[PDB]
Design a protein around this ligand. Structure first.
Ligand SMILES: [Zn+2]
Ligand SMILES: [Zn+2]
Ligand SMILES: [Zn+2]
Ligand SMILES: [Zn+2]
Lengths: 221, 320, 348, 122, 169, 40, 208
């Protein structure tokens, strides 16, 4: 807390030296729409995985499968922390997220030995849950990595079913303000390009765009 | 300008800048060719017992100038910064003067200097058909040779895009082509010299003939390799883009450093004041008038006197 | 001595071409520039004698840098694994440089081909993704098509079709070349069929065959029942045998060597077919060559669309972020929001 | 620019400028010109004895190399301009160690004599 | 002859400033809204000073934590100006800060350097028509805390425009 | 030694002032304490 | 210097080079610069402070019976500068600060009038007049603080009768522009003699 100054060496250009060395150029980056309100994997940095997003099953589908279950629509819990689970979703099986990339590599007999329930067939419907729908989304990506044709995700599984207020506790790794990053300590590039990459135009909380080239606008004046 | 990647296309500030600069069009209008109207003739600037300087001002819409040195004895001419929208007056001038074009000097390889270079070489070699013309240039401008197409993209020079530059062809400094045993117009150019950045007053010259020596000076800041011509017997300094009338060259282009431009202005203080400096753009001046009345040199020497270790001078709006 | 700011001590000239003579430098002058006084505690010197001539190599890497300098700038290899990999990493960087100049700029005018590309901003369809040929290559292209239209119009995907188009287009680029050094770079761009990589695959094949005879020698001498093409299994069998008897801590699980005997036989059959069309010897083809021509035509058709599909994927993201925000609008929906479309209790 | 960040053609790519000649097509020189440009005949290493020397021989192109102070500076860039048997890279050498005495008797011989000495002698 | 470049021994640091043409920049005259000092024109100098005291500061862009822009509306609702804020005594500032403004002890600490120096709230002319430049010179009591330089004489609200005309406002 | 007979006037190095740190003569690495072990 | 035993051969050979060319140069003087008359120059070999000292007798009118002798003392501290801020910060200007004590007739900071002057660009710039000890006003005012004593106002802001009376008091004491030139000359010789001792003492430390 208390507004720690950060140990990065970014700086705005002064009022004395000319603007030079335009084979790198920082400018302010402003996109069209806000993405911070959206789901975490519906944001801007995950757009390329947009076709990898699992189809959504909703609350009413989950209540209908609670009341009237199907033999091959497998409800699977993807929550990892055993200290944060307090209730049982009906007709659910426990396959925690951090083991999924190993779990689908097993045979059916090894799946039965290492989890106590049968391995789902690749044509069976699989429905995944988590606290917010984040561990279930990564698990759905791991389930779609293998050739599983029908994989669905209930976004906000436990927190809407049981009414809890929990989270999957995703870190989203951001450097500590004592950790000095790469381009300050290094002779990987020449001194002009090193000074021109480390400069920015404005405060260092917003996003910027780095230009690899620039030509002078001779047609203005 | 630059390559349109994913970040440049999803940026709203890019569309805001392209609306602010160019209005509702959004695309920059290029730098077009000067038409046959509003074009002036070639002027003979200087006549001397040794050489003759013949030039033409505002030969581009970059507002550059085209100069040629003529040796009175050997009948050999030399173009410097070959960029004229009509290199048909120059070939007719050379043919009606009974001159031989042997080399073309290039200060730096920006688009305001090498836009019509293949046209110069092709038309002058075609007139020589009724030994080819060599090119004298600095290899650091290699980094500006490869972006000749991109600069032809942004300034609307589409007919000069798909043209292999003669500085890119195989010279004597390069490995040779291993052709099938069963051509030499483009495979090898024996007349090509590469200037060295170690320029001195002893041996860094070109023997123009009749005892006239042209000392090339390595002076970066506007370009990584920028070569002035100095003729001390004629008091003539072809500066190129380093120094102009009451202004200096730009630094707001790539591979341009302000402290290199300051060192390039500082390596010019040993010439006399009656040396006529001849710039690539605009009107010509003298070095004494630039020592007295140019504010960029005043700022450079004032920053040097007050104690700046890295003096950085340079223009951000001017000539390319 | 110690210098002062603004005060310089003038020194006389040597009067030998200045500091760097532009006219030239003799052998005895350049001998002193060769064996320049580097500090020998941090300097490596190396010379190789190759018959007539010899080449000197001296590198000095300073002491105030080795904690901050990049591993690529100061290529220090403190192990034999770093020696073999650091040389092979610097192998391809140098080899792409000395090969890439033969077809781009500083190449022969018959060795430079360009592609024209145009992608529609709305429909995202590639229009005119052609090559820019000359008049000599287009005569080869219509010599290809007039022969194959005369063979495939009587029997048998429509009338206006180009038979084996991505095979002859890859062979027309190689045909119009005049330098063999620029010919092998196009063979590398077309699925890596150059003689540099094919002799690399032939070296690893003969190394696996020589290892297959060694495992065959061990298993016969120990016992005194095998797979068919044992040279593919022999890197995996020998990695266990050295692990079993005690000399080696790792056995191998890499199955990339399996199928390589039939794979490298197909690559040299692909290369021999590519040379057969350049010399215009396509007027008779064996049935083994006709199966290879159909396979290689579809393999060469998808390698020229690698960059165009990269830009196609970025154009997907461009039209994605321009979509209407929210879950959608009720005007443009076939399904209610809070349920699946396949729900039995759909219409309340 | 961003196209020249990762090699080939990067900033610190020291092989983008050019290659060596590696050919007998020019400068036919004698044995004295080889002796004056020996590494071992220079003054600064003639009185240097604590750095380690390694004498190796290629069995493919037949070159003789000597490397000094490689244990302190093991640069992988050393010998990158080697250009083995037929315009091949210096990853194709397969060097074998030779002693100091048999380096001197093999340094004067041409490459075919070195390869014949390796294959049919010793 | 080699002419020396004319320099100076003692030069002010304002002359070290950069211009892209190495020349004197254009000083465009302010818009027609500033011709008469009115209630719409009075508090534009107070708004920009509170805007700069809350924004980012320095080459490292240090964000000011205390937002002094929230007190701009209650300052102009009372009818007090930035030039009228400098005329208030010490006892009139404790009444203004505690009762009306409810300025906290850290928000009072970020505003007090602007009141200690008696900054002249005169909009300087600039190269654009919309000017965000306030003269940061210290004011004197003889010239109405307007610093008395460049024509800021005791009623000048904007550079290039008329006086205050206190009989109207 | 006058200025016109100097090594700095052989190149275009000026007579007095700040040293041209990006000139090729100032970028040239000098080791004069090892000069007697190489060129002697 | 064998490289197996001594890994610091890049520094020990460079410092042996720097011993000789600092002695083989002919621009240096072996003798100290000659001080003006009366002044005796002390300097400890390890420190960077050198002291000047002379006795003096003022001009005393005939109404007074006796002229008391004075004690003039010069204290010069060598100027320090930080090279870590270069080439970012500007070149720091060379100036020679010194102290001038005046004691009537036993240390430096008891009953002494201390005046600080700066020799910059060929002229003296008198900055402050610091008092130490109990002095007479008009009562007794004691300045017993030696580190944070009241140094007086700067003379740019001081009153005009204070200025012209002080310069008449300073020109009578033979402290002027020619005296400050010697302090600029003696401190250059002192720093040069300390630098060759610094190079000698560094070679004993690194080689050990
Ligand atoms: Zn230019
Ligand atoms: Zn120009
Ligand atoms: Zn070899
Ligand atoms: Zn003001």
């Amino acid at each position: 807390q208390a507004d720690r100054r950060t140990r990065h060496h970014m700086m705005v250009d002064g009022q004395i030296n000319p603007r030079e060395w335009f084979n790198w150029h920082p400018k302010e980056y402003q996109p069209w729409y806000f993405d911070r309100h959206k789901f975490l994997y519906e944001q801007r940095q995950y757009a390329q995985f947009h076709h990898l997003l699992c189809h959504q099953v909703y609350l009413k589908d989950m209540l209908h499968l609670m009341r009237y279950p199907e033999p091959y629509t497998h409800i699977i819990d993807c929550r990892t922390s055993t200290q944060k689970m307090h209730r049982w979703v009906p007709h659910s099986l426990w396959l925690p997220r951090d083991e999924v990339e190993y779990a689908l590599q097993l045979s059916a007999d090894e799946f039965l030995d290492m989890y106590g329930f049968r391995k789902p067939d690749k044509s069976d419907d699989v429905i995944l849950l988590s606290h917010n729908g984040i561990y279930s989304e990564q698990a759905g990506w791991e389930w779609k990595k293998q050739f599983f044709q029908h994989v669905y995700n209930y976004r906000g599984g436990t927190n809407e079913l049981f009414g809890e207020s929990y989270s999957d506790m995703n870190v989203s790794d951001v450097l500590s303000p004592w950790k000095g990053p790469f381009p300050q300590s290094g002779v990987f590039v020449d001194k002009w390009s090193k000074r021109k990459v480390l400069t920015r135009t404005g405060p260092f909380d917003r996003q910027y765009e780095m230009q690899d080239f620039a030509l002078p606008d001779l047609e203005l004046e | 300008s630059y390559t349109p990647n994913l970040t440049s296309l999803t940026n709203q500030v890019n569309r805001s800048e392209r609306l602010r600069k160019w209005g509702s069009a959004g695309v920059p209008p290029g730098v077009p060719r000067i038409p046959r109207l509003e074009a002036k003739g070639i002027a003979i600037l200087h006549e001397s017992p040794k050489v003759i300087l013949a030039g033409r001002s505002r030969c581009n819409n970059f507002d550059s100038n085209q100069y040629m040195l003529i040796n009175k004895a050997t009948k050999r001419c030399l173009l410097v910064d070959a960029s004229d929208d009509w290199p048909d007056d120059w070939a007719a001038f050379i043919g009606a003067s009974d001159l031989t074009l042997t080399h073309v000097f290039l200060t730096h390889c920006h688009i305001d200097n090498i836009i019509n270079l293949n046209a110069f070489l092709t038309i002058c070699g075609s007139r020589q058909k009724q030994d080819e013309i060599g090119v004298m240039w600095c290899p650091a401008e290699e980094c500006w040779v490869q972006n000749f197409k991109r600069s032809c993209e942004r300034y609307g020079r589409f007919e000069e895009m798909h043209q292999v530059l003669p500085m890119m062809c195989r010279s004597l400094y390069t490995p040779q082509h291993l052709v099938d045993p069963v051509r030499n117009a483009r495979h090898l150019r024996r007349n090509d010299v590469l200037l060295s950045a170690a320029t001195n007053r002893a041996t860094s010259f070109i023997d123009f003939g009749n005892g006239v020596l042209l000392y090339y000076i390595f002076s970066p800041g506007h370009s990584p390799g920028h070569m002035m011509l100095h003729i001390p017997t004629e008091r003539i300094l072809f500066s190129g883009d380093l120094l102009f009338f009451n202004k200096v060259g730009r630094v707001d282009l790539p591979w341009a450093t302000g402290v290199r431009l300051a060192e390039s202005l500082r390596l010019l203080e040993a010439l006399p004041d009656n040396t006529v400096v001849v710039p690539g753009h605009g009107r010509m001046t003298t070095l004494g008038r630039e020592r007295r009345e140019n504010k960029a040199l005043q700022q450079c020497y004032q920053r040097q006197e007050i104690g700046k270790q890295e003096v950085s001078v340079g223009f951000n709006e001017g000539y390319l | 001595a110690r210098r002062k700011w603004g005060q310089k001590t003038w020194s006389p000239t040597a009067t030998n071409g200045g500091a760097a003579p532009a006219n030239g430098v003799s052998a005895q002058e350049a001998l002193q520039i060769a064996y320049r006084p580097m500090p020998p505690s941090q300097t490596v010197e190396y010379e190789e004698d190759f018959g007539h001539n010899l080449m000197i190599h001296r590198e000095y890497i300073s002491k105030r840098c080795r904690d901050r300098v990049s591993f690529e700038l100061s290529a220090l290899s403190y192990s034999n694994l770093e020696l073999r990999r650091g040389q092979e990493h610097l192998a391809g960087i140098m080899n792409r440089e000395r090969r890439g100049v033969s077809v781009g700029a500083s190449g022969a005018p018959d060795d430079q081909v360009q592609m024209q590309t145009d992608v529609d901003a709305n429909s995202r369809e590639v229009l005119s993704a052609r090559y820019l040929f000359n008049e000599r290559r287009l005569q080869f292209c219509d010599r290809f098509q007039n022969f194959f239209q005369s063979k495939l119009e009587n029997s048998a995907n429509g009338h206006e079709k180009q038979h084996l188009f991505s095979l002859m287009e890859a062979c027309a680029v190689i045909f119009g070349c005049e330098t063999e050094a620029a010919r092998e770079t196009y063979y590398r761009m077309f699925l890596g069929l150059d003689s540099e990589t094919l002799l690399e695959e032939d070296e690893a094949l003969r190394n696996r065959i020589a290892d297959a005879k060694l495992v065959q020698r061990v298993l016969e001498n120990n016992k005194g029942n095998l797979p068919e093409e044992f040279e593919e299994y022999a890197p995996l069998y020998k990695a266990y045998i050295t692990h079993a008897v005690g000399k080696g801590p790792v056995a191998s699980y890499d199955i990339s060597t399996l199928g390589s005997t039939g794979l490298t036989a197909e690559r040299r059959r692909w290369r021999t077919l590519m040379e057969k069309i350049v010399r215009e010897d396509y007027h008779t083809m064996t049935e083994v060559e006709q199966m290879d021509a159909i396979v290689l035509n579809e393999q060469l058709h998808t390698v020229k669309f690698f960059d165009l599909k990269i830009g196609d994927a970025i154009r997907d993201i461009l039209q994605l972020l321009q979509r209407e925000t929210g879950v959608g609008s009720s005007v443009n929906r076939d399904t209610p929001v809070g349920i699946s479309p396949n729900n039995p209790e759909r219409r309340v | 620019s961003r196209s020249t960040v990762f090699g080939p053609g990067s900033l610190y790519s020291f092989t983008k400028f050019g290659s060596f000649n590696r050919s007998p097509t020019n400068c036919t020189l004698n044995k004295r010109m080889k002796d004056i440009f020996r590494l071992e005949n220079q003054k600064h290493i003639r009185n240097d004895f604590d750095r380690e020397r390694r004498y190796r021989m290629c069995t493919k192109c037949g070159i003789t190399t000597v490397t000094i102070n490689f244990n302190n500076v093991p640069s992988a860039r050393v010998g990158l301009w080697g250009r083995c048997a037929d315009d091949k890279d210096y990853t194709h050498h397969r060097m074998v160690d030779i002693t100091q005495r048999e380096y001197e008797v093999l340094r004067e011989s041409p490459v075919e004599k070195r390869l014949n000495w390796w294959r049919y002698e010793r | 002859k080699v002419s020396k470049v004319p320099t100076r021994s003692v030069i002010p640091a304002d002359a070290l400033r950069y211009h892209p043409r190495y020349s004197v920049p254009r000083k465009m005259v302010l818009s027609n809204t500033f011709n008469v000092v009115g209630e719409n024109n009075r508090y534009t100098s107070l708004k920009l000073i509170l805007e700069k005291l809350s924004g980012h500061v320095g080459r490292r862009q240090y964000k000011m934590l205390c937002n002094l822009e929230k007190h701009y509306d209650k300052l102009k609702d009372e009818g007090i100006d930035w030039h009228e804020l400098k005329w208030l005594s010490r006892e009139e500032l404790i009444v203004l800060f505690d009762k009306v403004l409810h300025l906290t002890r850290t928000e009072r600490a970020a505003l007090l350097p602007a009141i200690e120096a008696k900054v002249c709230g005169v909009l300087r002319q600039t190269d654009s028509r919309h000017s965000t430049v306030v003269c940061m010179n210290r004011g004197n009591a003889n010239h109405g805390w307007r610093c008395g330089r460049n024509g800021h004489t005791n009623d000048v609200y904007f550079e290039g425009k008329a006086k205050a005309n206190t009989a109207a406002l | 030694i006058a200025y016109e007979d100097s090594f700095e006037y052989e190149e275009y190095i000026p007579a007095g002032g700040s040293p041209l740190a990006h000139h090729w003569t100032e970028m040239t690495p000098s080791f004069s304490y090892l000069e007697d072990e190489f060129f002697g | 210097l064998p490289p197996s035993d001594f890994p610091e051969n890049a520094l020990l050979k460079c410092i042996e080079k720097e011993i000789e060319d600092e002695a083989l140069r002919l621009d240096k003087e072996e003798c100290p610069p000659p001080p003006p008359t009366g002044w005796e120059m002390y300097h400890a070999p390890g420190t960077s402070v050198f002291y000047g000292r002379r006795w003096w007798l003022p001009a005393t009118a005939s109404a007074e019976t006796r002229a008391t002798p004075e004690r003039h003392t010069i204290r010069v501290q060598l100027t320090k500068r930080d090279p870590s801020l270069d080439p970012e910060c500007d070149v720091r200007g060379e100036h020679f600060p010194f102290s001038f004590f005046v004691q009537r007739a036993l240390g430096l900071y008891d009953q002494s009038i201390e005046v600080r002057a700066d020799f910059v660009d060929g002229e003296l710039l008198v900055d402050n007049v610091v008092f130490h000890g109990t002095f007479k006003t008009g009562e007794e005012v004691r300045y017993n603080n030696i580190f944070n004593g009241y140094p007086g106002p700067n003379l740019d802001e001081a009153e005009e009768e204070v200025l012209d009376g002080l310069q008449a008091w300073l020109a009578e004491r033979c402290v002027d522009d020619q005296f400050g030139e010697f302090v600029g000359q003696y401190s250059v010789w002192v720093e040069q003699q300390e630098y060759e001792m610094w190079l000698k003492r560094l070679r004993d430390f690194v080689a050990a």
